[PDB]
Design a protein around this ligand. Sequence first.
Ligand SMILES: *[C@@H]1O[C@H](CO)[C@@H](O[C@@H]2O[C@H](CO)[C@@H](O[C@@H]3O[C@H](CO)[C@@H](O)[C@H](O)[C@@H]3O)[C@H](O)[C@H]2NC(C)=O)[C@H](O)[C@H]1NC(C)=O
Ligand SMILES: *[C@@H]1O[C@H](CO)[C@@H](O[C@@H]2O[C@H](CO)[C@@H](O[C@@H]3O[C@H](CO)[C@@H](O)[C@H](O)[C@@H]3O)[C@H](O)[C@H]2NC(C)=O)[C@H](O)[C@H]1NC(C)=O
Ligand SMILES: *[C@@H]1O[C@H](CO)[C@@H](O[C@@H]2O[C@H](CO)[C@@H](O)[C@H](O)[C@H]2NC(C)=O)[C@H](O)[C@H]1NC(C)=O
Ligand SMILES: *[C@@H]1O[C@H](CO)[C@@H](O[C@@H]2O[C@H](CO)[C@@H](O)[C@H](O)[C@H]2NC(C)=O)[C@H](O)[C@H]1NC(C)=O
Ligand SMILES: *[C@@H]1O[C@H](CO)[C@@H](O)[C@H](O)[C@H]1NC(C)=O
Ligand SMILES: *[C@@H]1O[C@H](CO)[C@@H](O)[C@H](O)[C@H]1NC(C)=O
Ligand SMILES: *[C@@H]1O[C@H](CO)[C@@H](O)[C@H](O)[C@H]1NC(C)=O
Ligand SMILES: *[C@@H]1O[C@H](CO)[C@@H](O)[C@H](O)[C@H]1NC(C)=O
Lengths: 165, 165, 297, 297, 200, 200
Amino acid sequence: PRAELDSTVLLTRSLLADTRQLAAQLRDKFPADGDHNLDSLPTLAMSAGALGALQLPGVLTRLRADLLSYLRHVQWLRRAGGSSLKTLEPELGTLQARLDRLLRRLQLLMSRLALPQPPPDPPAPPLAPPSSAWGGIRAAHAILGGLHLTLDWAVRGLLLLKTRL
Amino acid sequence: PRAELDSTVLLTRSLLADTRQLAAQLRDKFPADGDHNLDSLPTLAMSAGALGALQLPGVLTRLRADLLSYLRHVQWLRRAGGSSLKTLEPELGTLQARLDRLLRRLQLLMSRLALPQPPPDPPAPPLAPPSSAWGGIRAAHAILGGLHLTLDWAVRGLLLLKTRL
Amino acid sequence: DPCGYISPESPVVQLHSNFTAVCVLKEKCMDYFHVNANYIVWKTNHFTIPKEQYTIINRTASSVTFTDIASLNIQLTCNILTFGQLEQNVYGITIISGLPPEKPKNLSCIVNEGKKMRCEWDGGRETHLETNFTLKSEWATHKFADCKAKRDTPTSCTVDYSTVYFVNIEVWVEAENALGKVTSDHINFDPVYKVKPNPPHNLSVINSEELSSILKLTWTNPSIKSVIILKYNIQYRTKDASTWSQIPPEDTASTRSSFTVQDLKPFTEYVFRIRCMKEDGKGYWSDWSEEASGITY
Amino acid sequence: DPCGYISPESPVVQLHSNFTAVCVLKEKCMDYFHVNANYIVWKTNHFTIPKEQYTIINRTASSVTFTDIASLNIQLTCNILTFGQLEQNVYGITIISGLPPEKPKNLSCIVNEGKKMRCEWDGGRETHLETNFTLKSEWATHKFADCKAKRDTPTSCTVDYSTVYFVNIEVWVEAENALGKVTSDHINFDPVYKVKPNPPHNLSVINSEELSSILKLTWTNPSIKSVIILKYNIQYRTKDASTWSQIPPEDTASTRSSFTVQDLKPFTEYVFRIRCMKEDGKGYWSDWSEEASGITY
Amino acid sequence: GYPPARPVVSCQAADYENFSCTWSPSQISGLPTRYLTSYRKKTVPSTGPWPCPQDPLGAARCVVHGAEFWSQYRINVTEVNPLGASTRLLDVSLQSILRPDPPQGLRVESVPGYPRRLRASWTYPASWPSQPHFLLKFRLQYRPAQHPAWSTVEPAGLEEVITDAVAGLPHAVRVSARDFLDAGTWSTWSPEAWGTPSTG
Amino acid sequence: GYPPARPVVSCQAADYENFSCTWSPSQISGLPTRYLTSYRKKTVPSTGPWPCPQDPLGAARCVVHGAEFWSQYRINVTEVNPLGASTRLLDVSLQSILRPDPPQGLRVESVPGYPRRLRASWTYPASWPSQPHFLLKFRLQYRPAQHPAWSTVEPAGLEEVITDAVAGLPHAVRVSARDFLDAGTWSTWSPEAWGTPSTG
Ligand SMILES: *[C@@H]1O[C@H](CO)[C@@H](O[C@@H]2O[C@H](CO)[C@@H](O[C@@H]3O[C@H](CO)[C@@H](O)[C@H](O)[C@@H]3O)[C@H](O)[C@H]2NC(C)=O)[C@H](O)[C@H]1NC(C)=O
Ligand SMILES: *[C@@H]1O[C@H](CO)[C@@H](O[C@@H]2O[C@H](CO)[C@@H](O[C@@H]3O[C@H](CO)[C@@H](O)[C@H](O)[C@@H]3O)[C@H](O)[C@H]2NC(C)=O)[C@H](O)[C@H]1NC(C)=O
Ligand SMILES: *[C@@H]1O[C@H](CO)[C@@H](O[C@@H]2O[C@H](CO)[C@@H](O)[C@H](O)[C@H]2NC(C)=O)[C@H](O)[C@H]1NC(C)=O
Ligand SMILES: *[C@@H]1O[C@H](CO)[C@@H](O[C@@H]2O[C@H](CO)[C@@H](O)[C@H](O)[C@H]2NC(C)=O)[C@H](O)[C@H]1NC(C)=O
Ligand SMILES: *[C@@H]1O[C@H](CO)[C@@H](O)[C@H](O)[C@H]1NC(C)=O
Ligand SMILES: *[C@@H]1O[C@H](CO)[C@@H](O)[C@H](O)[C@H]1NC(C)=O
Ligand SMILES: *[C@@H]1O[C@H](CO)[C@@H](O)[C@H](O)[C@H]1NC(C)=O
Ligand SMILES: *[C@@H]1O[C@H](CO)[C@@H](O)[C@H](O)[C@H]1NC(C)=O
């Protein structure tokens, strides 16, 4: 029942709603036909069924690695997706800004709980630019059609942590 | 009674009024005590008494050389006179813009009258920057406390030209 | 690693015209799914394009032809029937439609005292496309800086160069968008004949003791009086009247800073308002002055 | 090739304080005119400074001392009596005066739905100096971008970062001008408690056929309902009434999108207007909704 | 004869751990019939074909236990007859397909002293085990008898006090459920329960 | 005794070719008296001291002919007695010092058919030779008899029709002159001339 953990869960729930809404808004204007993938996004494979067992270090380590990759891709989109996708601002930019804060919010969490910090990992090389404006939009469905799973798994994962500390 | 000459005289008379007004406005806010000089401005020495005799080539050649130097100095002021003299805008900038057009207006005059054009003269090296913000203002009194003589002598000189062609 | 693409990239077409879109699949993707041109399906804005409008040009490309375009914005998407149950997106393009800009008409400019030249023009039929309006201006041997219209107020610009009276200036506006470029007529004029001075201020009504049927008006003319000779219009009525009366224009055809109104009813209150403009009637009437009240002695 | 100069270059001093200005002549100019310190005359804004206020510190410099500065702007000029008839300008400086900025008080921020965080504060006594206002904001381990106030609206800023609900943010404003720097209190708050949602729209009044004394209100809540639970205030009166009545607040303390108003007079027309805010009363009341009219069956 | 047509497949899930999919023949023309069922986890670990066991060993339904909650699965239902196949492939994500059952035990009670207040209570559905990670949000609707239009509220928790009940009138009340993180879809409406506010 | 005090010097010019300056003793204490007069053109050509000749050879006035119109001149009037000097130095620019004489021959006439119009006419001053380079601008004032406040107009040319004359009343009219390019200063007012608008 930490004071710090309730607040972080609230922002993930807040961010999850923004991401689901933006994904649905995006599909309304630029429909997607089919499951879109990007080789660079992480696989979020972990079963909620067998999710209780996983203790405190794994949830926080996994969220940071997954969320950091997603931040780069959202940030990447606002640079090169093409004029076709300018219509998702400012909603897409607000998501970028709030998502950046949540990654920051997680780093503060690790310091206050005095948990061993992961080693400064080597940043991933740059993503090639999209091959077309529509290629960036198709990439956009994949990037924030995935970002509402990482955040979804964060609310679920963080609620597990509250049950312990 | 050329159609081209009446119009140019009107703009000099227009510009003369703006310059006299700006010089008086300037003296009202930043009084000057004494006759200010700059080594770079031309000496406008020509007597209106013995001014009839001077024919068409001299009036136009003298105005261009004098006015081109004055344009540089006005333009120079808007770059480096100091924040103290920012209060003379936008009136000072309008004078710069209209003065530029009149120099242009004179060059058009020479072409339409098919007069021999002066050789492209070597531009004067740069004026050293003012030693202080107030040094620029003192320089300002000299620059546009002189620019209302060149223009004054232009109206007078151009009216002489109308009497001939 | 897309499967293919549609060409043209992002076309803009004219309303009621024809448009043909071609979707081409890369060979590598075609091998992977074991499909060809006959399996391409087109969708737009969540609407399935009816199969009868498709045209297989070759096994690598499919095409559709739109006629009488009536949508301002058409989102076109190309999808493939890979297993024959699952639809996957190949490519997409956005089709934007509209009209070329109409030739600007009723082009006019105005020089408000103390401000830079401003020009207004009538835009024509709505074009539905982002249309840029650029004010072009040049005197005769050198072209001065351009005005790119702001999204707000698409019919107006305020130049970045100071107004220069007594020189004829050539002005025109060029309207251009993805479907076309057009220029307004090349009107030619001297800004001095397009001035809209500010109205006179410090207007005062004074009660002369002698001749109880006479009132003298005084005011300060606008600074623009240094370049042009002003003409004015003084209107007056009784404090209770519903309509305004007017001094004969011929009596006020030239610059002055005062006027004595006569034949007014004794010890009656009168309200005055004034406006002024260039003596030759070439230009625009200024706005109405501040209201003024007065009472005779 | 000036003759001398005044120091300090361009001072700013506090009202009612003392200021000493020193004018120093270069040696070369002094030789040329055959003068010294006793010949320096001071002038300000066309006013001759009375000789009794001068102080010759040495033959190279003269000084004046101002007490109880009461002018917002003083233009000081130093001149020399060269031949003893002709006055020539040596140097000049501009003296600007004012007050240091007062500590901002009543600091408050507001998050209008769809817009970025905006903060307002009460400026204190006029300072007569160009005073910059900078909104500082930081969460706890990193400081985010600053708001430099615009000349227009000196008491407000709209941040450049998107609003982030559910995280406490430390905010304060720092006011600074040539005479001083000061900071507002370091208030601390969560933007979620400073939201001013837009008012409900699409408000509809419906005439139920059964129970001619009952009318049902429906409307669409503001998007901000996804983060906080809303509370609303519904006011109503008869089409001819002069004052508004109100449903008991306790009956409307939590998010909902409809409400049935009862005990209304039969076949009578009623006008409604609504506003909403965060369920805990922490924040700001929204603006009034669009007006709505209705008639019972 | 002719090869089989594509079978019609639907999946569902009323809880967060296991989900299940069902299929029906689109045509009763192939007399002998059998079904091949399988599924895989699409990537971007042998995630290949895993059998979907058929629960009472004859029904038209298979269940996948211990499914990955956030991953997407491609279910392969294949109809086979002695003459061919017509595999139906159906994409399913546990986070998308989920739909809880309506709340249970909905009761509505008057609130003494307040002639226009009612207290509504209800319980979780039995198919959803109460666990701290996945709550459910609830949506309550109420409507006075003989009136045509519903009013909607979004209660916190398992109870809701209605405050705009028409005085002296029976009220119908029904509720629906959805995963608290907006996963899946809203439940079907509960059976209506009736109550009448107290007098005074 | 004591050295002379600085003399008092004024200059003036009613035309654009020559100008003239005058000086008076500030004190009649130095009995024998003489004046040294000179002037130079300040620069930024022996522009040194040039004598200022005294016209009827005894008066307190010297004239400079063929002066540079736009240049600035520093006039040196020196009082000398057997005991010393007190040179007065006075800066003068022809473009600044110029002041024309009032217009001449001002006449005001009624305008038949218009009971509130008058036609004013006047001529150049004799000290200003009409020449196309330097016109004069004019400023006309009119005032009805017994009234205290003047009305001002800025006529083009040598004539002006007044349009707000009070009917049936004598009007006083006076005018002043200035160089048409706003050089120097406005003239003194002309002598008033009277006229009365026609009846009808
Ligand atoms: C969905 O599941 C069905 C059921 O397994 C899949 O059908 C299978 O398809 C493969 C071909 O890809 C068959 O392989 C066999 O290979 C041998 C050796 O050449 C040959 O003798 C057979 O005639 C056949 O080609 C396999 O037999 C068949 N399954 C069964 C039970 O017969 C189907 O491919 C799956 N759909 C997917 C993965 O999209
Ligand atoms: C204004 O004009 C007067 C009149 O000329 C100027 O007075 C002149 O001043 C000079 C000194 O600068 C005198 O020079 C003489 O030099 C000889 C040789 O040393 C000496 O014997 C004399 O006693 C005197 O110093 C000159 O005599 C004197 N003029 C006259 C007529 O005596 C005055 O300087 C001028 N003011 C200026 C230019 O500011
Ligand atoms: C199949 O048809 C498409 C139709 O576009 C062909 O693509 C064009 O190919 C020509 C080759 O001469 C190029 O010049 C064009 O630029 C291509 N246009 C596009 C939009 O692709 C394609 O080459 C054809 N393929 C075969 C094998 O015929
Ligand atoms: C005359 O007085 C002025 C007063 O300022 C002197 O100027 C200062 O000189 C000191 C020398 O120690 C410097 O440290 C200061 O920075 C100077 N200040 C200014 C404003 O000039 C000047 O040196 C004095 N001269 C003599 C010969 O005593
Ligand atoms: C295609 O274009 C032609 C010519 O522009 C037109 O006549 C025809 O109606 C259009 N549509 C078709 C052929 O479907
Ligand atoms: C309209 O103007 C903007 C501003 O520079 C420019 O970026 C855009 O390309 C213009 N649109 C055209 C030329 O169609
Ligand atoms: C100078 O300053 C002192 C102290 O600030 C003050 O008492 C005095 O009145 C001021 N003015 C003078 C000395 O003229
Ligand atoms: C006020 O802000 C402007 C904007 O950058 C800055 O240039 C100026 O120096 C500031 N004034 C101060 C710091 O006194």
